[PDB]
Symmetry: none
Subunit: 209 residues, 6 copies
Amino acid sequence: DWVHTDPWRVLRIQSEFIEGFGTLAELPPAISVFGSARTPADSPEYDAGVRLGRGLVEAGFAVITGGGPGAMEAANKGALEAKGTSVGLGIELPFEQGLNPYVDIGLNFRYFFVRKMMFVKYAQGFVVLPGGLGTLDELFEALTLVQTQKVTRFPIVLFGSEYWGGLVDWLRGTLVAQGKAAEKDLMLFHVTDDVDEAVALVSKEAGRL
Amino acid sequence: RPPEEQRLGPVLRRRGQVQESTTDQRLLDERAPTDWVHTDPWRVLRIQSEFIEGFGTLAELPPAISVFGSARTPADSPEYDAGVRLGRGLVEAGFAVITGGGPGAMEAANKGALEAKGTSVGLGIELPFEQGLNPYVDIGLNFRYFFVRKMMFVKYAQGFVVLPGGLGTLDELFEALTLVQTQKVTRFPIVLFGSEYWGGLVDWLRGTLVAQGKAAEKDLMLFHVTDDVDEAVALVSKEA
Amino acid sequence: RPPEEQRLGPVLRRRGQVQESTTDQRLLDERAPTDWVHTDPWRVLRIQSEFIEGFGTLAELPPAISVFGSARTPADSPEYDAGVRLGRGLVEAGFAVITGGGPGAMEAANKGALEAKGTSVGLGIELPFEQGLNPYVDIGLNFRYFFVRKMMFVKYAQGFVVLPGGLGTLDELFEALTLVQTQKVTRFPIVLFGSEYWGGLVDWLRGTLVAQGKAAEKDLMLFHVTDDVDEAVALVSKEA
Amino acid sequence: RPPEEQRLGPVLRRRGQVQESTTDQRLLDERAPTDWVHTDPWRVLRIQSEFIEGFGTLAELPPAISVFGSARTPADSPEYDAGVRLGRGLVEAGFAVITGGGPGAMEAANKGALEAKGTSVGLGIELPFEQGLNPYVDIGLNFRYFFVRKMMFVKYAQGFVVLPGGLGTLDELFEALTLVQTQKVTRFPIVLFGSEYWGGLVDWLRGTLVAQGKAAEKDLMLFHVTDDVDEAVALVSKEA
Amino acid sequence: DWVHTDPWRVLRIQSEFIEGFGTLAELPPAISVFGSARTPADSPEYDAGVRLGRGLVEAGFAVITGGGPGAMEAANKGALEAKGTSVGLGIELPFEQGLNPYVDIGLNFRYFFVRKMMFVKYAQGFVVLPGGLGTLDELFEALTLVQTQKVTRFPIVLFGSEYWGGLVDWLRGTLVAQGKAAEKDLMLFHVTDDVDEAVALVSKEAGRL
Amino acid sequence: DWVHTDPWRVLRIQSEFIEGFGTLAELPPAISVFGSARTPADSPEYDAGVRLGRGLVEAGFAVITGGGPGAMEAANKGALEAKGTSVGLGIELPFEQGLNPYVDIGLNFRYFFVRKMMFVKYAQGFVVLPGGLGTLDELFEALTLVQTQKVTRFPIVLFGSEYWGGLVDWLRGTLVAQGKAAEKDLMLFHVTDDVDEAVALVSKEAGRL
């Protein structure tokens, strides 16, 4: 009754921001990592995320994920192995769930847009492992944030040139070519297959503001 | 004559604990350091205010569809004509039309919604260059927080129609998709307009994502691709 | 035994990120610097609290009229007798009586409202000298923010009756007038009592303001001047 | 191209008063000093959030009884068996069962409530050692503010049942008692289980407090002492 | 439904204060200017407001108006000519409206009492050009604020001795004479026909607290 | 209608915290005093509370009570006699009431749990004069706060060894003996009949954090 009204909505929304600002205020410099929730632990892609997490911690960063399995877990796990600060920000879903075992500091948000915002405010760059719809979501959000000057010194690194190449050809081939985007917009992200270059690009471009 | 007892709301002050100045005078005279305006706790109050303002101005919106597409689309364009056609289509189906309030395809849809004498919404966003809401916007706001605006596009709509767009348009597209895929939202039709435009994207989604297990084939059923404005409108009214 | 995992609401802390003290202990032991109480962001929370307290205590007020007039009016006075008469008049017409809760004409009206066994409201304001709410106030608050109190006088009333007053009374008078002139408020009768008192003011409004184009002649119809308590009451019940 | 006019919500900026950065960029890039997280004004926002979270998660609770008792009660115990019996008893009477979510007697009652296929609530509290909610808790929260949790035990319940307990249990016991004695709460049955356990306390209340005028004899009627689970349940359903 | 309830009211009201405090926190010393919305641009009264705005800026002040036409516009316009900071605080009304073209920093308030309060908090004095009902409103509010010690060092200058003289005679002749006010209360304001004296009185009496 | 809903509840609750934090922020070190509201002024118990209040002020503390009569009034009265800061925090009840005449700084709370919290946050220890149900309430709340480490350096002194002895025997004899509490939990409080020892214990154990 009262719980489906805008006055109650504002109070719940605002309390999630307070919970996010409070919990994340004193985080060190971070990078948000995204990727497939489905990636199996036996995989090379999984190993890359473990390697990526480890290398981001070595570069001074905390690592933030969605707290789920697959590539998220891999990156959190690597951040732990390296003795870094491992963060997970979950979204409450209809199914039963839980933050992955390698997350040290976590929150759950009910509101999709509050959580989204946390990923960008408390990080200074994004790394994107091969992933699904939710991964594409955050990828393109970051790209429009950078293109519209709502974040600065915000590197966006795509990992896996064969995985992402098809999308990249369509961005150039269709979007840029029809003037939906400019050719300078394609330089807002980088693509690589080497975990050390992913980290170096991010270290060079993020933060120090 | 300075009081021996003060009753200020729920507070009691007697004798030495009575104050020498009035509450109001401290409030209305005192300018102090203003560091606090540039801090996150104050920003949180600002963000909350913007949510409040949004819900207040969109309180009596009827059922709507949120339309997205390129800011750069020329007005002599077939894409642009499709956007007007669609704005009109949606009004006639009983929906309000919500857009980014920009130029191009956004303007096209708002224009169409006015031609059909419907309710035309433009939810703007602050940009680093000069750009006002488009001339066919009727209910207008300019948001300053991106993430506040994102939530208004979903909350007040029952589906998306996505004209051919840039990075901004894909950002919304994939947001609605994951919201529907994760079942945070339900009965939320998503329609893309322009099969030659969207076809290379859909081919990569199938040939790379689905093919490697990152999505399921049934996840590509969460949207429809069409070149027909009257089909797009029908799809949305059926499902919303 | 210090935890390896803490679940504190929506927050998860594991291993090194677990805290060494409890949330409560930091809250209940720690007194820190208290600069913040003297800052505007905190004042904003105080102001909001006072609004909340106001609406809470006036939640079940019936229809009311807000009465104003001099604080200094003597109790043996014909003005004072008129105020009692009017308080009574308004109760009998079905209204609650709202005043500043002061002495003089305010007290007169609250007194009258009690004689008629009605609801008698006194909305006080902090002053630099000792002065409590008057003895005929039944629902009483002492506000500390002027501008919070101003809004309560309009929100809970359907009209003003203005006995002969000082600066404070004119401040409210002209507030209601511009609110009605600008059509921010509607169906809001304003009645002045005392034609010999108010006549020099009305003459200047006509002979200077209206005559030079600052107001319209029809703007002087937004109030009525009377010497008859039973006319004043009738005017208000007709229009409110 | 940096704007000559900015419209950001209700705010207008022209010419020199236009800003050089966007609102969002200041929000999303800037990490500043973070003293504010350790201050009382921010704690107040945290406390409010926890209330909000509580009411949200307990929004559709049916009528409940709040059960208290020792954390240390062994599971092979007659006290423990009584707690299961009682949890079951209350469900069968139409009540939800609310507890501290701990072990011992709390766990006993939650267990019992599940056996009877009812709604089993565990309102936890942060402690300095590792301790999760008990395995028979169904609706679970872990509060970090003691005083927020205290109010949830009363607000969502219509009575207390108090199994033999320690300091924590007496704290709640005497809270409900004074709430009922002062008539801040009404129709709020309080039942103690275990006459050999509670008898020395009741003897002191009579032989010292009542006997010296600190309480009235009728104040000892605000609770009942029983050894019978089916009596305790009946008492509560009669009075709540 | 929910929008006409006190819980929603509190949230809207409070958000207007946040919007006002936020936008005006870093304003320089200011003076609020009031007057007829109807004053025509050809007028001497209009010229006086332009002259007044210019002279307040020269005296170190920002100039705040209601953002409307006539005397408001004149004063804002003068503040611009002088290169000062020109503020306009509007009230949303049933008609269509807009802040005057010479306003540099503006807000619109829905709540009358929030806006009123802004005029006094963010200024240190009032100047009152010949005006109507709304002008009398702010004039008398300031006078009771000063009389009841809710602002201090708050000059109140009335411009136009023939315009305001009638009111002044009635304040003395009727109010003071019947003890509704004291003779010291008449010294809370000043009346003048010279723009330099208006400014000098305000400069001497306002602020420095 | 709207006033019995959770959105309005949150706003009222929160405003009481703001009122409490605001009013009490700058309080000096304090001790909260509890006891019978029924204690008559002719009594030795009453004299003890006057003596207790006086001695707490001499020990540097402000004295906080519930603002009622009896032992509350006695302690407030003693704090005044000593020229200390005398605080009273009332709870609004169905009856007509008022803060005792010796309270210098007072608030009234509608919410029981907000007021309770104020007693502990703004004090550093509790003294408990012979009292009733409400006195036992605060006594046991403090004891579980200390036992669960939610306050530290928080002395709890019971005054009157014959009054409290019966309860103490039952805590030992029944609770401790059945393992509902440990024997170290009985050392969380002290019992005494001398007002100077009550004060000395409190002075030794409270605050300095």
